[PDB]
C-alpha cells in the first residue's frame, strides 16, 4: 500500500514543476552563478545582495526539485529491497524517508499560498446575484450553500454576517465570514463572476437560460481609523476675535487657529471668550477633520475596488453549469468535472488546487 | 402516449396466439424461453425471406414451427438445402424433435409486418419518408385492403427535431373488436438515430 503514496508524491510534484518552471529557472540560475562568479561583483553590493538571495530563491526551486527525482527514486528501490529479502527494517528506514520528502514537497507547495501578503486572515466572502434576476437569485442561494459546505469540509467556521433574501425566490446578496486557517489563500482564487448557464425553472415553457452571480473575497485588516493627535505636528496660532466684546476682544488674544503641519488642514474657533474654550473647541474640530480625511482615504480605496470589480454580466464569467449536458467548467485553468451535483456539494478543491498556480 | 396494442386487444377474438400449446407451472417458463430463442434465430435468418408470422406448436418432446413468408424459396433453398440446414441448427438449439414447416404469405402487401419492414428498409436507404409512407399506403389499398395507416417516428430525414409523420386511407377502426386489423412494427437504424415504423392494415371486419 506504500508505493501508492509515492505514486502521489510524483503527481503533485510534476505540475509543481509546471508553474514553478524548472525549465525556465534552471536557466536563470546559471548566469547569476556567472555574474556573481567573477571577482568584481561586490562593487555596488546592492546589485550583489539581490542575486545571492535570488540564488537560493532559485535553488529552493531547481535543487529542491533535484532532490525529488533522485530522492523518490532511492525510495522506490529501497522498498523493493525490503519485500524480496523479507527485511522489514529496510522498509521502516525507507518510510522515515518518505516522511521527510513529503515535507520538502509540502514546503514547495507553499509557493502557491505563501505568496499573497496576508493569505492567512479570516477572510470574508461577498456573494451577489446578477444578470437574470429570479433565476440568478436562486443560483446565488445555491452558490452560498456551495461555499458553506465547502468551508465545513475544510475546517473553516461557517459564520454568516449579512443576508438579504430575494423577493421572488432566493438571495440577492450574502456575506459570510470564513473564519478559519489560511482561509484567504483558498478563497481568493474563488474571486470572480460565476456564470451559471443552466436550464431554468422560473421560465414557463421550460427554456434554457443563463444567469450569473459573483463571489468576491477579501481578508481582514485592523479597521481602526482613530489616529491620535500628537503635539509634534500641530501649530496653534492665537489672536483677537473679530466682532463684539468691548475693551475685551480688542485687548485679548482669545481666538485660536490649529493647523496640522503635514496635512495643511487649518481650523479656527472664536465662539467663546476664553482662548481655552476656543483651544478646546478647535482641538475637537481638528480631530474630526483628520477623522474625515482618513475617512476619505478609506472610501477612496473602496471605490477603487468597486470600479475594478467586474459587473456580474454576460461575457464576464468563469464557469458553466450546463446541467443539460452535465458539466461545470472553470474557463481559466481550465478543468472539466462531469459529476456536477458533486461540485455543489463542495468538491471545489479540484478547481482551487489547480487555480493557485 | 395512450393507444392500446391492436393485436393484444384482439387475442381470442380476431387474432390467435403465435405459441399455441399447454404447459404446467413447473415447465412453462422453459418452453417459453426456448420459443423465444427459436424466434431469435429464425427472426435473424429468415429476415431476407420476408418473415411475417412464426407459429409454434408443442406436444411432448416434439415441436412444430410454421414459418409464414413472402419468399418461400429463400427459406427452402435448392431442393431443400437451406430447409435441411435449418432443422440441424434448429434441433441443435431445441435439443428435441423440431419439425419446421413453411407457408405462403398470399399477398405480402396485405401483410402489415411486411409493409412496415419495407418502409423501414426504404428509410434506411435515405429515401423520402413522406413519399414512402404515401406509397406504402397506396400499395396496401391497391392490394384490396379495406383500410390502411402507416406511421414513422423519429429524426426524419436526419432533422434534429424529432417528428411523427403518418398517412392513412379508408377505414382503420382501432376501437372495433370484430374489425380485423393486422399490425406490424419495424425498426430502422440510421447514422443519426432510430426511427420507429408502425403499419396497420384493415383487412375486413368479421
Amino acid at each position: 500500500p506504500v508505493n501508492n503514496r509515492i505514486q502521489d508524491l510524483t503527481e503533485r510534484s510534476d505540475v509543481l514543476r509546471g508553474y514553478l518552471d524548472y525549465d525556465a529557472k534552471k536557466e536563470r540560475l546559471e548566469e547569476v552563478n556567472a555574474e556573481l562568479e567573477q571577482p568584481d561583483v561586490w562593487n555596488e553590493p546592492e546589485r550583489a545582495q539581490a542575486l545571492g538571495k535570488e540564488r537560493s530563491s532559485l535553488e529552493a526551486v531547481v535543487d529542491t526539485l533535484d532532490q525529488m527525482k533522485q530522492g523518490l527514486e532511492d525510495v522506490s528501490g529501497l522498498l523493493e529491497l525490503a519485500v524480496e529479502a523479507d527485511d522489514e527494517e529496510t522498509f521502516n528506514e525507507a518510510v522515515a524517508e518518505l516522511d521527510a520528502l513529503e515535507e520538502k514537497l509540502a514546503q514547495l507547495e507553499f509557493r502557491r499560498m505563501f505568496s499573497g501578503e496576508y493569505d492567512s486572515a479570516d477572510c470574508y466572502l461577498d456573494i451577489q446575484a446578477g444578470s437574470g434576476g429570479t433565476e440568478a437569485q436562486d443560483w446565488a442561494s445555491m452558490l452560498e450553500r456551495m461555499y458553506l459546505r465547502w468551508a465545513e469540509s475544510r475546517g473553516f467556521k461557517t459564520e454568516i454576517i449579512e443576508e438579504s433574501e430575494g423577493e421572488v425566490a432566493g438571495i440577492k446578496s450574502v456575506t459570510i465570514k470564513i473564519s478559519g486557517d489560511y482561509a484567504y489563500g483558498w478563497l481568493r482564487t474563488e474571486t470572480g463572476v460565476h456564470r451559471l448557464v443552466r436550464k431554468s425553472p422560473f421560465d414557463s415553457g421550460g427554456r434554457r437560460h443563463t444567469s450569473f452571480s459573483s463571489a468576491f473575497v477579501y481578508p481582514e485588516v485592523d479597521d481602526d481609523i482613530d489616529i491620535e493627535i500628537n503635539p509634534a505636528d500641530l501649530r496653534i496660532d492665537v489672536y483677537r476675535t473679530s466682532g463684539a466684546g468691548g475693551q475685551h476682544v480688542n485687548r485679548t488674544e482669545s481666538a485660536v487657529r490649529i493647523t496640522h503641519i503635514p496635512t495643511g488642514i487649518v481650523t479656527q474657533c472664536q465662539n467663546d471668550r476664553s482662548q481655552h474654550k476656543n483651544k478646546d473647541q478647535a482641538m475637537k474640530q481638528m480631530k474630526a477633520k483628520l477623522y474625515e480625511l482618513e475617512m476619505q482615504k478609506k472610501n477612496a480605496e473602496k471605490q477603487a475596488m468597486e470600479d475594478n470589480k467586474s459587473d456580474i454580466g454576460w461575457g464576464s464569467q468563469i464557469r458553466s453549469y450546463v446541467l443539460d449536458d452535465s458539466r461545470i467548467k472553470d474557463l481559466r485553468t481550465g478543468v472539466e468535472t462531469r459529476n456536477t451535483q458533486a461540485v455543489l456539494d463542495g468538491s471545489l478543491d479540484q478547481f482551487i488546487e489547480a487555480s493557485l498556480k | 402516449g395512450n393507444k392500446i396494442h391492436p393485436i393484444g386487444f384482439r387475442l381470442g377474438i380476431t387474432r390467435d396466439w403465435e405459441s399455441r400449446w399447454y404447459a404446467g407451472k413447473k415447465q412453462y417458463r422453459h418452453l417459453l424461453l426456448e420459443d423465444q430463442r427459436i424466434r431469435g434465430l429464425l427472426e435473424k435468418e429468415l429476415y431476407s425471406a420476408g418473415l411475417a408470422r412464426v407459429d409454434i406448436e408443442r406436444a411432448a418432446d416434439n415441436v412444430a414451427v410454421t414459418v409464414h413468408v413472402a419468399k418461400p424459396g429463400v427459406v427452402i433453398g435448392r431442393g431443400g438445402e437451406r430447409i435441411r440446414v435449418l432443422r440441424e441448427e434448429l434441433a441443435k438449439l431445441t435439443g428435441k424433435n423440431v419439425a419446421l414447416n413453411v407457408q405462403e404469405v398470399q399477398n405480402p402487401n396485405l401483410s402489415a409486418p411486411l409493409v412496415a419492414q419495407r418502409v423501414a428498409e426504404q428509410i434506411e436507404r435515405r429515401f423520402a419518408v413522406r413519399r414512402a409512407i404515401k406509397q406504402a399506403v397506396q400499395r396496401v389499398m391497391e392490394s384490396g385492403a379495406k383500410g390502411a395507416k402507416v406511421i414513422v417516428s423519429g429524426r426524419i430525414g436526419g432533422a434534429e427535431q424529432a417528428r411523427t409523420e403518418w398517412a392513412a386511407q379508408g377505414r382503420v377502426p382501432l376501437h372495433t373488436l370484430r374489425a380485423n386489423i393486422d399490425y406490424g412494427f419495424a425498426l430502422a437504424r440510421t447514422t443519426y438515430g432510430v426511427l420507429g415504423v408502425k403499419a396497420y392494415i384493415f383487412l375486413g371486419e368479421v
Partner: protein, 60 residues
C-alpha cells in the same frame, strides 16, 4: 454494472440465499415473475405480441 450482473446471477453462488431471479429477457432484477422468468415489462410486451400461450387481456 450490468452484463456482469446478468452473468453473476446465472452462476450458482457460494450460499443459496444469494440466488435471485433476473428477467431472462432484459436482465431486470426487479418485478421478475417466477412462472414466466420475465419482468413485468417484458411480460406485458410479449403478452401484447401474443407470444405467451393462453395469456390474454383479463377483463371482468
Amino acid at each position: 454494472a450490468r452484463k456482469a450482473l446478468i452473468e453473476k446471477a446465472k452462476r450458482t453462488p457460494k450460499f443459496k440465499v444469494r440466488a435471485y431471479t433476473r428477467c431472462v429477457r432484459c436482465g431486470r432484477a426487479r418485478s421478475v415473475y417466477r412462472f414466466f422468468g420475465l419482468c413485468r415489462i417484458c411480460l406485458r410486451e410479449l403478452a401484447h405480441k401474443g407470444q405467451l400461450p393462453g395469456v390474454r387481456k383479463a377483463s371482468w
